[PDB]
Each structure stands twice: as structure tokens, then as C-alpha cells.
């Protein structure tokens, strides 16, 4: 395994989004790229990463490898890189250490992160027909979930012709913000109404700096899909309703 990124800031940002929610995970490396799929401690939410090999300069993974990593440890080490820097990931003899090298143009830093052993599993993600979907500024989805969380633990989300509606009830009082089809795109095939923990949605919005747009997809009694799309891949969160 040898993979190099143009910019170290985008690796930093991914880990910032994931690490609060997942402490340990396997990074599954292929010819197609590096991917990650994991649950939170409580099996309520699921994360799926994909950085395609397109987003690497000299990217090369001969055989298929799984790298078990504490994501805090990785984040600490990634903070030692400047945003401007050239990251290089290397994994050579044993899945016992992951090597990172940061450079610019101009000096060199390099670090080793101790790996661990995690288990293989396949939570199958039934791909499907989402009755309603919204896409909007990532910034605004962040603003709303931030603000609602200060009033209560849960939000309920209504999708209809009226537009899409986010509702609270808490001790302070209650209320709602609603968005219509103005940029905010909507597509409902039906109406859907579900309730979710704002603790989890707030953690998903740490992905805001990876993409200026975000996409929420729903169907009755089916986990919500929050998707942040990037070039050369994606980050996705699946959340079970209450």
C-alpha cells in the first residue's frame, strides 16, 4: 500500500466527522480505493466512507488489506500536518503500523501509527426507493440541527407538498423551521414523517466542511440517509428513527 493525497486538509476533515461517532474502525483498502463502514457504540447509526483511487496521485494497493485504527490516534497525528502539505500513506510488511509522511514545497515530517485488530462484518445496506429526498446547503442543515438541539433531544421531520418541516417540543417551548422548493431541491413521491435523535444529527453535521451541499433521504420505518458528496467519493450516515 502506497497512496498520496494532494491536500492533507481533506483527510483531517473526514476524521473530524467520523471520530466522535466511531472510536475504532477498519479502513478497507482495494484497487478501487479506501473505504470504511462502521456502527456507533449503540448500533443506532452507521457510517460509510469512500475515497476512490481517483483522489490519489501515485495510488497503489496490490492486494486487499484491512487497517484497524483508533480514529483519535489517527486524528492527533493528522493534526501535525499543515493544510497545504502532501500526505503519503504507506503500509508495508505487517498490518502492525501505518506510516504517514507530510511534505511541502519545504520539509518532511513522518509518523507511525500503531494499528490494532478489529473484526470483519458486513452489515448489508439494503439499497432502495426513498419516498422523499431533500438537498440543501450543508451550512443550513448544520444551523438548524445546532439550534434545535439547544431546545430538545429529538426532532420530527415531515415531508409533503407544504415543503420539509423540522419540529421540536422541549421545556423552553416548541417550534419548527420549514423549507420549500426554492438552493433547496425536494422530491417526494409520498409524504413521510419520522422522528430522530438530534444528538446524532449534530454529530453528522461535523461533516459540513467536506461539501457545500447535503442530501437527506427518507421512507417510513427506514433509516434516514444523510449524504455528503465529494470528488472521488462520499461520506454517508444512516440513522434509525425513534
Amino acid at each position: 500500500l502506497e497512496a498520496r493525497f494532494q491536500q492533507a486538509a481533506l483527510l483531517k476533515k473526514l476524521l473530524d466527522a467520523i471520530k466522535e461517532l466511531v472510536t475504532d474502525a477498519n479502513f478497507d483498502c482495494n484497487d478501487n480505493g479506501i473505504s470504511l463502514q462502521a456502527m456507533d457504540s449503540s448500533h443506532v447509526a452507521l457510517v460509510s466512507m469512500l475515497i476512490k483511487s481517483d483522489g490519489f496521485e501515485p495510488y497503489r494497493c496490490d492486494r486487499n488489506i484491512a487497517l484497524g485504527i483508533n480514529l483519535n490516534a489517527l486524528s492527533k497525528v493528522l493534526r501535525c500536518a499543515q493544510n497545504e502539505d502532501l500526505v503519503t500513506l504507506k503500509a508495508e510488511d505487517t498490518p502492525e503500523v501505518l506510516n504517514l509522511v507530510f511534505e511541502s514545497e519545504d520539509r518532511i515530517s513522518d509518523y507511525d501509527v500503531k494499528l490494532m485488530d478489529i473484526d470483519q462484518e458486513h452489515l448489508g445496506i439494503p439499497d432502495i426507493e426513498y419516498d422523499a429526498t431533500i438537498t440543501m446547503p450543508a451550512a443550513e442543515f448544520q444551523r438548524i440541527t445546532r439550534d434545535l438541539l439547544t431546545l430538545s433531544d429529538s426532532v420530527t421531520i415531515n415531508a409533503s407538498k407544504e415543503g420539509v418541516r423540522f419540529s421540536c417540543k422541549g421545556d423552553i417551548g416548541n417550534g419548527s423551521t420549514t423549507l420549500k422548493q426554492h438552493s433547496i431541491e425536494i422530491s417526494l413521491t409520498q409524504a413521510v414523517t419520522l422522528t430522530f435523535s438530534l444528538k446524532y444529527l449534530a454529530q453528522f453535521t461535523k461533516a459540513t466542511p467536506l461539501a457545500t451541499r447535503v442530501t437527506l433521504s427518507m421512507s417510513n420505518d427506514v433509516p434516514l440517509l444523510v449524504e455528503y458528496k465529494m470528488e472521488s467519493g462520499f461520506l454517508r450516515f444512516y440513522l434509525a428513527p425513534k
Partner: peptide
Amino acid sequence: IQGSLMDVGM
């Protein structure tokens, strides 16, 4: 009260 993904297919 909250339910898990195992509850919705998975």
C-alpha cells in the same frame, strides 16, 4: 424510545 438499524433490515 429509540430502536436500532437491526430493527430496520440491516
